[PDB]
Design a protein around this ligand. Structure first.
Ligand SMILES: Nc1ncnc2c1ncn2[C@H]1C[C@H](O)[C@@H](COP(=O)(O)NP(=O)(O)OP(=O)(O)O)O1
Ligand SMILES: [Mn+2]
Ligand SMILES: [Mn+2]
Ligand code: NI
Length: 422
DNA sequence: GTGTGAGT
DNA sequence: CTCACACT
């Protein structure tokens, strides 16, 4: 149960090349063809953020210029993100995301984790399904696209063989058997994904396991329109060669410290250290967390749908682009406040609350820190012009140039945020 | 109130 | 870019 961290059934659903599929739903002509989506069109045709699987076979990857990508995929077609106030506009994608989320919310409550993925806690649905099943076996036909991680031992054929070996050894009578709960959870996810495709046409992948970390890791294991079930017994093999920085929450300084201090590279190697050793090197909390996590145990619950605590937006101006004149800072503050007003207005329309505070943050050229300073003021009226003047008033004192004709030092970031909701 | 980390 | 939270 809880001792072995097998108390819940959690799943993660992530859309395959989400932006590409959204383009395919609205503009048919790009469908079933190698394509990509670029961001900025003049420098080099734009950075690539979403690539179709057909094009991935040719070696094309994201974070590389469109013209440089045409090198190995001459058939490659390009689609562009609309631009607004100098930054990307994702309304189309966010609305499609909402569509999918609403369809998923029918089977169970979800936790939106990004623009194209969300976690689902199926524990209750699994109980209901185990009752309604009434002891009938689970045939492989109920899982047409499910992969069992770690099997077979000793491509569609491999999937079916692993599924047969998994199903033939499952407990039938012990209704609290972790493996049985996962199998039923995968059945429910098969239904959920079938419904999602039927009503929207989108394809996706999913991961099924006992916690968020394993569900996420499992989702990307068998990438396009496939789902992976990760049992507690399969964790050791899966972790044997799993990069530490690939585990949710260990991708930053903590993970790097673990690698550096213990001289290891893969998650599976942490199993050899004692809990006291992990606590003596990383602290009580991180030590216990690592000790349980390397054994497949994690407890963050899938928290329910929530109202945002803040609404904000920002923009970066690197190098040459650094804001030097007063006109520039005034104009960009105004642009930000107009986007803010648009969002605050929709927010107030949908949730009957008004933000009472405006937080202003900036970054000065030459400073390594994320923000040079942050200040706040009352946000009484949802008027972009007023907010722009208030933000300017708090940031104007910073200007060190007694000339008053320019900004010295320049600003490399502007951030506006509404909070203290009611 | 700052720092960290996930996800784009 | 956008956001949340743990710290403290
Ligand atoms: N750095 C970035 N900046 C802006 N948009 C981005 C971005 N990175 C990703 N996007 C957008 C591009 C993507 O369309 C969207 C989903 O991100 P994923 O789920 O991580 N990748 P995908 O869904 O494409 O495919 P797959 O399921 O095989 O992983 O995020
Ligand atoms: Mn995706
Ligand atoms: Mn994703
Ligand atoms: Ni004015």
């Amino acid at each position: 149960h809880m001792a072995t961290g097998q108390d819940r059934v959690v799943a993660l659903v992530d859309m395959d090349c989400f932006f590409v599929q959204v383009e395919q739903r609205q503009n048919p002509h790009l469908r079933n063809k190698p394509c990509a989506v670029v961001q900025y069109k003049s420098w080099k045709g734009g950075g690539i953020i979403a690539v179709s699987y057909e094009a991935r076979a040719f070696g094309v990857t994201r974070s590389m210029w469109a013209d440089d990508a045409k090198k190995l995929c001459p058939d490659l077609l390009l689609a562009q993100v609309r631009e607004s106030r100098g930054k990307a506009n994702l309304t189309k994608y966010r609305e499609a995301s909402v569509e999918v989320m609403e369809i998923m919310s029918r089977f169970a409550v979800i936790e939106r984790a990004s623009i194209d993925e969300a976690y689902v806690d199926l524990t209750s649905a699994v109980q209901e399904r185990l009752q309604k099943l009434q002891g009938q076996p689970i045939s492989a036909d109920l899982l047409p696209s499910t992969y069992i991680e770690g099997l077979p031992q000793g491509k569609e054929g491999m999937r079916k063989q692993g599924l047969f070996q998994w199903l033939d050894s499952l407990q039938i009578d012990n209704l609290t058997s972790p493996d049985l709960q996962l199998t039923v959870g995968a059945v429910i996810v098969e239904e959920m994904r079938a419904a999602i495709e039927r009503e929207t046409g989108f394809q996706c992948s999913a991961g099924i396991s006992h916690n968020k970390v394993l569900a996420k890791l499992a989702c990307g294991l068998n990438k396009p329109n496939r789902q992976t079930l990760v049992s507690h017994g399969s964790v050791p093999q899966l972790f044997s060669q799993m990069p530490i920085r690939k585990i949710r929450s260990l991708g930053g300084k903590l993970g790097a410290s673990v690698i550096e201090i213990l001289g290891i590279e893969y998650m599976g190697e942490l199993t050899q250290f004692t809990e006291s050793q992990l606590q003596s090197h990383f602290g009580e909390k991180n030590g216990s967390w690592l000790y349980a996590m390397c054994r497949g145990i994690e407890h963050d619950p899938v928290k329910p749908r929530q109202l945002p605590k803040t609404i904000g937006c920002s923009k970066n101006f690197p190098g040459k682009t650094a804001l030097a004149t007063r006109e520039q800072v005034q104009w960009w503050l105004l642009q930000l406040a107009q986007e803010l007003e648009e969002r605050l207005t929709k927010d107030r329309n949908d949730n009957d609350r008004v933000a009472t505070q405006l937080v202003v943050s900036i970054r000065v050229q030459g400073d390594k820190r994320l923000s040079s300073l942050r200040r706040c003021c009352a946000l009484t009226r949802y008027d972009a012009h007023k907010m722009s003047h208030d933000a300017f008033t708090v940031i104007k004192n910073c200007n060190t140039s007694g000339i008053q004709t320019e900004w010295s030092p320049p600003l490399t970031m502007l951030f506006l945020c509404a909070t203290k909701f009611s």
